[model samples]
Target: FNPYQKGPDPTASALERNGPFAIRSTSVSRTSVSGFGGGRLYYPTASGTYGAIAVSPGFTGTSSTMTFWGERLASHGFVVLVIDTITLYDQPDSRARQLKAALDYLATQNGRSSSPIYRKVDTSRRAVAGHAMGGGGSLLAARDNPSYKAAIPMAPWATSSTAFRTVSVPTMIFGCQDDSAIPIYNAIPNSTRKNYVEIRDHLCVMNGGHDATLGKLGISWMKRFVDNDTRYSPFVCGAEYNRVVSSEVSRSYNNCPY
Candidate 1:
């Protein structure tokens, strides 16, 4: 059996909704943490170790923007930490550092005997995600840290000089047609498993609303990569993916059969 795999078989409909695991959440005070502004921790109450994920919000945005994702992914069987940057004006690079810091914090909690998440986190299988500048930060985090299993950046905005050519981790980028931010599909080498999905909507896809299509894609990518579960591959590529692209997605690209 696949030890990393969690929950039942994935379907397009099932992935669109919350997964089987019941979840609980706790707030992490900023003053209690260092390197990053502490936000909140969301995780499954069920008894198995799950991969951990750290998510950051965009410029001038708070952890609230990432709450939906944290809760959704946690219910799907991951330790999700939605973080606040040290400052509202912190840029993508700074957010990248904070993302790593947040994951470090999670690792510390996992090792603490008295911690609620003790022994519940699989530190080796961590992922990162974010929105806009925070999205750009996730890419940078994955680029800098090859240990990250997966990365999903939504409507990412970053400097032109920012390069992801060295990113070896599997990555999926969500873009919006009306958004000014550009997708960095070409920057990441074709050898790496990467995908770019652009929706027919405005910027802030994660912030403005919780689109089921986006949720399915994000969860599938994490499961397929972070969890090393092939059951989610069908959703990330092939027939099911074609149907997804036919809907709200205006354009999509990927090296399929991953």
Candidate 2:
């Protein structure tokens, strides 16, 4: 639950502070799995070699809406992965585990698996994140991938079959008051070391209608922070991205203590 909303605050606002670098950017994955594993590779023109991420909710969500978010990081030269819908409802495969599989697949393209399309993936700067279910699962994978510099969970639920508590990665949770699926209050447990929860509190137009934009924004955060794109630094934590969100330590997990 984020109190730093679109309205004015008595002291300072969350947006006024440095966020976890999950900006809304461009850059997206292509369709028709470029190579093995039937996944797409988002070749955004970012500055570094970023990795891909798997989206949830059947992956029906489009990369187009968040293409700009990806593109923004691409502008900084980071590679982005827009996951295709691979898992069906209640499939034997756990959503969190499958996301790790997605990363493994990316390694194949990067030549780790010695696949046909051996992409020069920057294994050094890799991370995982997604919207909704993808968020919870990404946290699960992050448990294994400490190299993961950040976690972007947009509108994530608190409870996780994935055991998201072990998640110590820098995280950012995006939510809104009007979000019924994962209400603003449901985003509580997302807090972790170096974490930031962004909230849009508005009844008009159902709180800016940004829920539709979470998929895109979540990816951008991966590129900027994970790929180490410093363009939006001021807002996210860098100079330009400085206005990303708030890091008021008072908002730590101990503050509310669940």
Candidate 3:
């Protein structure tokens, strides 16, 4: 059931502030991933290991457009990577492969003595995310990959919703209400994962939309589920179905307190 109560001033956006960690960003020229040319890795300057996430940009989109996610998540104690594919027009399957490869590359860097992230990357604690075509690929990358702690696909665009059948991890599917590129139905949640949440809000074409809403929810989702921290429970279970930027929000998590 939907435990996140209704009734709040600003919904998800309130949680978007930068977290406690100081962060840094760098571009890596080498990777084990085949299709991607390289990627940008954003990580905390703190000396502790933290959860990691990799993001893919939408079709014809570069890692620049997805940089906000890396900076936002990284400041919040996550090792975030905004990946770039060799071809901007890569399909969902290809994008998924690239995303996995990016995670693999991050894991490799975690062991390198010369890397700032050396031993600071909790390679086992990981997630995948993206928007549009990259969003669809997020779901695909998490499919059958039990290593992922969580997966979120924002305003995903896919030819069919059948891709969800293969996803076995907690997945949040979001879409822009006015998205003319892909119908809202394309963002459907067909996964049988433990937690499957569906949300629709103003289009993310603006910086204030998904950048504030989805970005915040993503941080909380990973914190509560991946980090297993109860402190974020208040935000996740008390901010939805209320007065917020997002138009319609619905969720299902066993621990949700209704």
Candidate 4:
């Protein structure tokens, strides 16, 4: 999927790919991410915010859609990179590979471009996140790879123990019972500690359509976890949060346990 657009410019550096500064693909099929897709890195022009971040889109999703998350993160004074995972991978496991590669690439990107407002790209303070199949994949990579500081799986699917029990760090898997694409059974063991790991865990159901509006939801999360403020109770796995995703209708739970 092509993520380059030619719309008006925002705070992000307008990389002319095909069209304007907007996040749209002129030719979706031509820009399918195989080994790696073309991407634009966004850094906040302002100061005093949080750590650097990377947002990896789903294998079937485009970088433009993922930019929504990246843009939000960069707005908070963090170096944000939106990755293109919509290539070569059909399953969730392959998506995990993309996450690993993307994180590795970010760790090396010291500083390629700059401006009066744009500053250096900080490879440190990196994190990985995704939606749907990508969600499950992020958990797998973080479980095996140590480079990832945190893993956030939006409306995730944990169909196997390999994805659930393998988790070695903190994880948040948002789910919705009504989503046919993902069922509660995908979360494994049905209990919070199915794997019996005592790490920080959060399992919630939201009122949205899968992981569409992840950026808006991410604002609250980024403030707590990304900023390292431990008071955020939602980060823990008890139950709290159920907001609208794609449609105006609602699903999942909020404040109470899911």
**How do all the candidates rank in terms of TM-score, highest first?**
1, 3, 4, 2
Candidate 3 on 54-122: residue-level lDDT in tens?
A: 888888878888877888778777888888887888998888888888888888889999888999887
Candidate 1 per-residue lDDT over residues 78-190, each given as its tens digit: 99999988999999999999999999999999999988899999999999999989988999999999999999989888885238778788989898877733437778878
The better candidate by lDDT, 2 or 4, is 4
Error of 3 at 140 (Å): 0.2
Residue-level lDDT tens digits of model 2 in 47-104:
2334554443323343443343343333333445545444334221355565566566
lDDT of each: 0.88, 0.43, 0.68, 0.46
Q: What tens digits encode model 4's per-residue C-alpha lDDT throughout 154-225?
A: 656556743464454445445444442233223333432211111111222221232223433454344344
What are the clashing pairs of model 1?
none
Candidates in order, TM-scores: namely: 0.96, 0.57, 0.80, 0.59
Q: Which stretches of candidate 2 lie over 4 Å from their true place?
A: 1-37, 45-75, 90-93, 112-119, 158-162, 180-192, 201-224, 228-233, 237-258
Best of the two (2, 4) by TM-score: 4
Q: Considering lDDT, which of the candidate structures 1 and 2 is the better prediction for this target?
A: 1
The TM-score obtained by model 2 is 0.57
Better of 3 and 4 by lDDT: 3
Local lDDT at 216 for model 4: 35
